[PDB]
Each structure stands twice: as structure tokens, then as C-alpha cells.
Design a protein around this ligand. Structure first.
Ligand SMILES: [Mg+2]
Ligand SMILES: [Mg+2]
Ligand SMILES: [Mg+2]
Ligand SMILES: [Mg+2]
Ligand SMILES: [Mg+2]
Ligand SMILES: [Mg+2]
Ligand SMILES: [Mg+2]
Ligand SMILES: [Mg+2]
Ligand SMILES: [Mg+2]
Lengths: 124, 222, 256
RNA sequence: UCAUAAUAACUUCUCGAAUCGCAUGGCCUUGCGCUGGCGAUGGUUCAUUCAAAUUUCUGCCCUAUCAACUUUCGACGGCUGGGUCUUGGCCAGCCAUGGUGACAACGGGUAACGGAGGGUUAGGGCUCGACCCCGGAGAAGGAGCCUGAGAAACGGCUACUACA
RNA sequence: AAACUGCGAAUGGCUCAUUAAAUCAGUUAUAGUUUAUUUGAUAGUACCUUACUACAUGGAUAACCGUGGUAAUUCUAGAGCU
């Protein structure tokens, strides 16, 4: 939208234990619906002099009546730290990791139960 | 009446079926572990001695040796019993078992060659299956090739070439990594155990010496 | 069959943990060690529910066994190690040391010690006997066994044990006029001065404790913890172990 | 008669490491010589932890159209032993005649699991509590048992009855 | 990978059939006991057996190869190793 998106940061803390920085991000976006997770990430990256792959955000809940969203933002010191620390479900949604394709939960359990009737190398 | 003949020396296995029981007549009242001549089975079996090793009745129930009964019985088996595979720690199960006395009402009987005859049965003596080498313990290697205490066991290891995954690469060999062999690591571990043991030795004695020192000076001033 | 329990219910968890009631059905269960479980404090609660580093179960589990948290200078990879009283928690990655001391509300607080208070601990003498070889030995409140204590440490004394060798620097005798902290009962986290000691044969002797505001109290020697002979040997949390009523607590907020 | 120490002996003589990884470094009689840390698993005793198991005092709804109950074959107790992780009529032998009850024993009913608690009440109360928590018991109905620190386990086994 | 070994499977979940000094509740004791796990300590011993050795002892068994049985089970046997 024509009106600028205002960035805010509260509860900022430096956490070298996971090699990241934790904070809560506030958005002031009047006269527009909301901001996507993607465009939120570059704005954080350009504010913290980091890259898109340096930044991940968890959950954006828009405040009642619009014009404001809040959420938890996570920026990392190194890209390797993000890959080693950020959970796999977060990696697949942001796009730089492949989903671990696997069968259905019931089918895997049924697949396992058939194995219990087999012994030795006959299983494979 | 199918017979499963085994040849322990050559590791040969073949099944031959006999439709006429009169050649099995001398086998009727025998017992598991009995060495029996196979003259009626001949004439290709002349000069051959067979040992009874068990058999299955017409219902597939195995023979458990030591059960003196020509019929089927139910026993409470356990971990070490010879016809039960316990799937749980301490679990016991009652299973049908055929007695050790061989005879009629039997499907397959297991045999073993005891003494070689002057014949060549196709499938038993004609084939000499190589033994699945080989020894893995250090002393077992030492006794097998007759080494000495100061010989290098590290090089007397049985090889087996393996063909790579059709890539045209150079084939290599696997080896039975020898266990219970002396390494500097094992000697270092033995050195470390005594090193830790000795370290505790002065620590307790100096604290015992120390605690005596305070008591000595405490009583003097008291 | 019958055996020890392995789960814990969130509703039945100790109150001083200050756990969210709607977060889940279960609560962390301490394994064993610096107990009693009533009261103690799991490592996960200390790092997740007090520092949020460590936001949920996965991250705190990663932190625990990256070998970055030293309880009393010792590496602990137990996600639910029972951190207890006077225990020193160290995070070299951020470079600070924490100590667990009860506040007036009766709950463990995030107390900070800078550089030198992490070199020792105060422990309460629970047992003195003769060892396997006629060797006198001493047991503290944190299961620490000392194989050679001073002969004058009888019972209930507080010994300053060094945190990299286990040796005793000094001890405080349990007598009137010593600075004491109440570690149990209704007066949790209250620091005062021992005034009276009445002996009742039967194992429920009472100790009278006087506060900095001339307030008289009473407690058993199962909850009296000696801190200093003339002045406290450690750094007290904010409030210095003085409990204020609901009115004065509100007034402190309105003024501040 | 504790902690602990000491002596005389004993044992189908327990433990006292024939286990694994990383770093590989020092010394002099240069021998494939002597030494060197961090860990992993495991190990005797003591303490500790999660506990478990018994255990003291007090407290349970209705019923006399339930007034005497227990004790042959344990009922109350004493002694010796066995068994148990341990105490104990827990059990085996010998001796004595005790134990409970109108302050309700014993027996019967419960459409009774106990409690923290729910509903409704000025005070005093009435009623419910299978059920998000603590304790108990059970896994079609009884009994028995192996493994195991921990089970009389049942998504363990064995036997009988019913069902299938 | 398979298999041997170790650990867990005695937690959890479900139900309220039995049960009226019984369970349970508050309060006591274990000086009348056991305890996997965790935590801290903790063991020097010329004791005596093998053909002997400590620069290091012995024999089996899986996995695997091959031969089967029974209509059928998370049934298993015989034979060669390790
Ligand atoms: Mg049960
Ligand atoms: Mg614990
Ligand atoms: Mg110990
Ligand atoms: Mg008697
Ligand atoms: Mg007796
Ligand atoms: Mg009922
Ligand atoms: Mg009902
Ligand atoms: Mg059973
Ligand atoms: Mg349960």
C-alpha cells in the first residue's frame, strides 16, 4: 500500500545458545489488509543487515480491527546455525529444505506390523 | 517316506524319497542318535553308516530327543529347549512334540553320514562345499595356521574378493576383523586403569596423613 | 504390574514451579539427585520457563546436551535434572552464573552472581558417622559425601564447600545469634536471626527466628538453614528475606 | 547388642575390569622399551533419590423383624523354630483359657470404591461425589507361575468353567 | 541391513465389579525392611587354580549358505561355519 509499513521490536534478547536473536515484532500497517510472511522477512533482514535466509518468523496474528499484527521473529547469526537449529517444519514452509516424503501414518504402522511376522533377511 | 541326508564333512544336502517301506524296516524301532547301517537302502549305500538325527511326523511336528515315546506329547518348553523359540524373557509355552523313538506315522526323517563308503552318490559325495571361512579370534587364527607367540597374526587373515556395483571398478576384499588381539590401546587402557588406581592410592593416604595432622595439633593445644 | 511412576500431571505439579495450566496435560518430572522433589526445580523449567532460550521441549533438550550448562561446575545433560537449593548454574556461552534461593513468596527466583560466588556453596550437614574404615564422613543436604570433616561439625551446621575440589573452607555452628534462612513450611524464603531453641524429645524441636523488622517466628530445625555467623556468606535476593504484608507490597508499587 | 574397631574360624568363595572410543603426547638403556589425559560401560560398600511395603491414634450410610459372636481345623496370649526383604498366629510344634459386646459387638442391606470436592443454604444444615486430581482394585470368572530391582502382569505364560 | 547383547515393556490409558475399621483422610514409626535408576564418595593385600601365559584363556550359538515337514501360527528340524 501507499502508507509505509512500520517495524517495531520488543523483548529483544541475544541467545548464543542457539546462535540466534529472539524478539517480538510489531507491525503498524493501516489501510492495508496485512503483510505476508515473505515480505516481512526482507524488511527484518534489511533492518538487521541480514539476508532472507538469515531470518524466520513464526506466527502472525492480526489484531482485531486490522492495522496491526504481532508475532515472534527469529534472526540467526549464521545460515548454518539456522539449518542446524530451526525445526524441519519451519524449513519446509520457508522453502530452502525438502519435505521428508513418507507414507501415511496408518499405512506405516500396518507396514511395521507385517514385519513382525517375518524374521531375518526375509524382512528386506 | 522322504529322507533328508546330511554329509557333515562335505556339507552336502539332498532329499530322496522312498516309496517302499521294506528298505526302511530296519529303521522302525531305532532312536535318535543311533548309528545304523544303510545296506537295504543300497546297493549304492553299501558300506554306509547313518545316524538318526530326528524327523517330522505327518503333521509337521518336530522330534525332541530324550522323549521316550513313539507318539506325540505336549511339553512345557522354555528358552533352552530344542523345539521352541521364546519371544519374551522368561516366557514358557506348551507345544506338541513328537517323541525321539522313530517309526511309522512319520513324514520326513533326518540322516547323517558317519562312515564313508566305496561309492559316489550324486549330490552327497560328488560335491565338496567349501566351509564358510573363517576364524575371527586371535588364538583361533594362531592355532589354525600353527603360529607362535611372536608371529604376526595381523597378516594371516582370510580374504574374500567382492565385485563392486557393476561400475567397472577395482574389486577389493573384506576381512574378519580380529578380536581379542593385543593393541597399544589395550595396553594403554591397562596402563590407565593402574594409573587411576595409583592416583587414588596417594590421595587417600595423604588425606589420612592430613587428617592425622589436624588431630595431632588439636590435641597438643587442647 | 506394580512399580514406580514415570509421568507427572500438570495439575498436581508443585505450585512454586509456576507452570501454565493450559499448556498441556503433563509436567516435567525430576529424575533423582538433589531432591526432595518437594521441593526442587527441574533444569528445563529453569531454562525454558524462566529464561525462554529454550522456548519448548525440543530447544531445551538441544541446549542440555550441547554441554553448555554447568550445575555446580559439573556438566549435566539431564533435561530434568533436579536443581535444588544453593546449587550454582553456569552458562559459559552467555557468561554468567545463577543461584537458586527462595524468595518471600516461597518460589525459586532467577538470582544472579557475578564472578566469585560461583566458587563455593553452603550445605547443611545432615549426617555424621564413621565410614567403611573407621573414617569419619559427613553428608550435606545435596547428597554430597565428605570423607574428612572437621571434628567440631556435629549436626545442622552449614559448611562452605569449594566447588572445584569439594574441600570445606569454613563452617558455621547451629546456635542462637546466627543468620538463618527458613527453607520450609509457611515461612519459605525468610531470612532472620536465631533467638530461642526449645528442646522437645520426640523430633519436633522449634526454632525462634527474628526478622530485620523485629518480627518473631517459629520453625522446626528441618526448615532452618544457617547462612552466616555474623553476616550472610552469600548474596541475598531483592528484599533481603523480609516479607511484607499485602498493604505495604501495594504501597511499594504505588510509590514506585 | 548403634556407628565403628579388633580376634578365632567358615563359604557349591560375591566383588576386586581378559570391555569400548578420541587425543595421541613425553623420557632414555632405542627396546616395535617405560610412561601419559579425557570419556563410555561396568563394579563392592555407605549415604542419597524416585519409591514401595507394612505401621500408631482418630474418624465411615441404613438395620434389633440382627443380642450374643470367636474358639473342633487359631480364636486371645506365651515360648522354640521355619518362612519372608523384614516384624507379626504368617505358619509348624508345646502350654494356658482367653478375646469382642447394649458406649450396638456379630449378622444383613447398599441401586456403596474413599477423599480433595459439586449443588443449595442468615446461622445451624440437607444432598450428591462412576467421572480431567491423590489413594485402592480389576482386566470374560478363579487359581498358579517364569523372567525381572520392581508383576501374582494379563496388548506374559499354564490349567479349569463359560463363550468363541 | 539381518541377527546376538543391553534396556524398557510393572509407565501410561480405561473402568468402578468387589469392598463398611475394609479402602481412604489427617497424623505417626520402621531402632522391624527392600530398592533398578540418579547423585557423592568408595576397593593396593604374597588369598590359589589351570599345560602354562597377562603383549591377553576356553567352548558353544545366531545372522548367513543349503535340505525340508504340515491345510494352517510371529511353528520350527536336520547339516557347515563364525
Ligand atoms: Mg493388576
Ligand atoms: Mg529427579
Ligand atoms: Mg556410594
Ligand atoms: Mg502362642
Ligand atoms: Mg516367634
Ligand atoms: Mg456397585
Ligand atoms: Mg455402577
Ligand atoms: Mg500367571
Ligand atoms: Mg496405571
Amino acid at each position: 500500500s501507499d502508507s509505509p509499513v512500520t517495524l517495531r521490536t520488543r523483548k529483544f534478547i541475544r541467545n548464543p545458545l542457539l546462535g540466534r536473536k529472539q524478539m517480538v515484532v510489531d507491525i503498524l500497517h493501516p489501510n492495508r489488509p496485512n503483510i505476508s510472511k515473505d515480505e516481512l522477512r526482507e524488511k527484518l533482514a534489511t533492518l538487521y543487515k541480514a539476508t532472507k535466509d538469515q531470518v524466520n518468523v513464526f506466527g502472525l496474528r492480526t489484531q482485531f480491527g486490522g492495522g496491526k499484527t504481532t508475532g515472534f521473529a527469529l534472526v540467526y547469526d549464521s545460515p548454518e546455525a539456522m539449518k542446524k537449529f530451526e525445526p524441519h517444519y519451519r524449513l519446509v514452509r520457508v522453502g530452502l529444505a525438502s519435505k521428508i516424503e513418507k507414507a501415511s501414518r496408518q499405512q506405516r504402522k500396518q507396514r511395521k506390523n507385517r514385519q513382525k511376522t517375518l524374521r531375518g533377511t526375509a524382512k528386506v | 517316506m522322504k529322507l533328508n541326508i546330511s554329509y557333515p564333512a562335505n556339507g552336502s544336502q539332498k532329499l530322496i524319497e522312498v516309496e517302499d517301506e521294506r528298505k526302511l524296516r530296519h529303521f522302525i524301532e531305532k532312536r535318535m542318535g543311533a548309528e545304523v547301517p544303510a545296506d537295504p537302502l543300497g546297493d549304492e549305500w553299501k558300506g554306509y553308516i547313518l545316524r538318526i538325527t530326528g524327523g517330522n511326523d505327518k503333521q509337521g511336528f518336530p522330534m525332541k530327543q530324550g522323549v521316550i515315546a513313539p507318539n506325540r506329547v505336549r511339553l512345557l518348553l522354555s528358552d533352552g529347549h530344542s523345539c521352541y523359540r521364546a519371544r519374551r524373557t522368561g516366557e514358557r509355552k506348551r507345544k506338541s512334540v513328537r517323541g525321539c523313538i522313530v517309526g511309522s506315522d512319520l513324514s520326513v526323517l533326518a540322516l547323517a553320514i558317519v562312515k564313508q563308503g566305496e561309492q559316489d552318490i550324486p549330490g552327497l559325495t560328488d560335491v565338496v562345499h567349501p566351509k564358510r571361512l573363517g576364524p575371527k579370534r586371535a588364538t583361533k587364527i594362531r592355532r589354525f595356521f600353527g603360529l607362535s607367540k611372536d608371529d604376526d597374526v595381523r597378516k594371516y587373515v582370510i580374504r574374500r574378493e567382492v565385485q563392486p556395483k557393476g561400475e567397472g571398478k577395482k574389486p577389493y576384499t573384506k576381512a574378519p576383523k580380529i578380536q581379542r588381539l593385543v593393541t597399544p590401546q589395550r595396553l594403554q587402557h591397562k596402563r590407565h586403569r593402574l594409573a587411576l588406581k595409583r592416583r587414588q592410592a596417594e590421595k587417600v593416604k595423604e588425606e589420612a596423613s592430613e587428617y592425622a595432622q589436624i588431630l595431632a595439633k588439636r590435641i597438643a593445644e587442647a | 504390574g506394580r512399580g514406580p511412576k514415570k509421568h507427572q500431571k500438570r495439575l498436581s505439579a508443585p505450585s512454586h514451579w509456576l507452570l501454565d495450566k493450559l499448556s498441556g496435560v503433563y509436567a516435567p518430572r525430576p529424575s533423582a539427585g538433589p531432591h526432595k522433589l518437594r521441593e526442587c526445580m527441574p533444569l528445563i523449567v529453569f531454562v525454558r520457563n524462566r529464561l525462554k532460550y529454550a522456548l519448548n521441549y525440543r530447544e531445551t533438550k538441544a541446549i542440555m546436551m550441547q554441554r553448555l550448562i554447568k550445575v555446580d561446575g559439573k556438566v549435566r545433560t539431564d533435561i530434568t535434572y533436579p536443581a535444588g537449593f544453593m546449587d550454582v548454574i553456569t552458562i559459559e556461552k552467555t557468561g554468567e552464573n545463577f543461584r537458586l534461593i527462595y524468595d518471600t513468596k516461597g518460589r525459586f527466583t532467577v538470582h544472579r552472581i557475578q564472578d566469585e560466588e560461583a566458587k563455593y556453596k553452603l550445605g547443611k550437614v545432615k549426617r555424621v558417622q564413621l565410614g567403611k574404615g573407621g573414617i569419619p564422613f559427613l553428608v550435606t543436604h545435596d547428597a554430597r559425601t565428605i570423607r574428612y570433616p572437621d571434628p567440631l561439625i556435629k549436626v545442622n551446621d552449614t559448611v562452605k564447600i569449594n566447588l572445584e575440589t569439594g574441600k570445606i573452607e569454613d563452617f558455621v555452628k547451629f546456635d542462637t545469634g546466627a543468620i538463618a534462612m527458613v527453607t520450609g513450611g509457611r515461612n519459605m524464603g525468610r531470612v532472620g536471626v536465631i533467638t530461642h531453641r526449645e528442646r522437645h524429645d520426640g523430633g519436633f524441636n522449634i526454632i525462634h527466628v527474628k526478622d530485620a523488622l523485629d518480627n518473631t517466628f517459629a520453625t522446626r530445625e528441618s526448615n532452618v538453614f544457617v547462612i552466616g555467623s555474623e553476616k550472610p556468606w552469600i548474596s541475598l535476593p531483592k528484599g533481603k528475606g523480609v516479607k511484607l504484608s499485602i498493604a505495604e507490597e501495594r504501597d511499594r508499587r504505588r510509590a514506585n
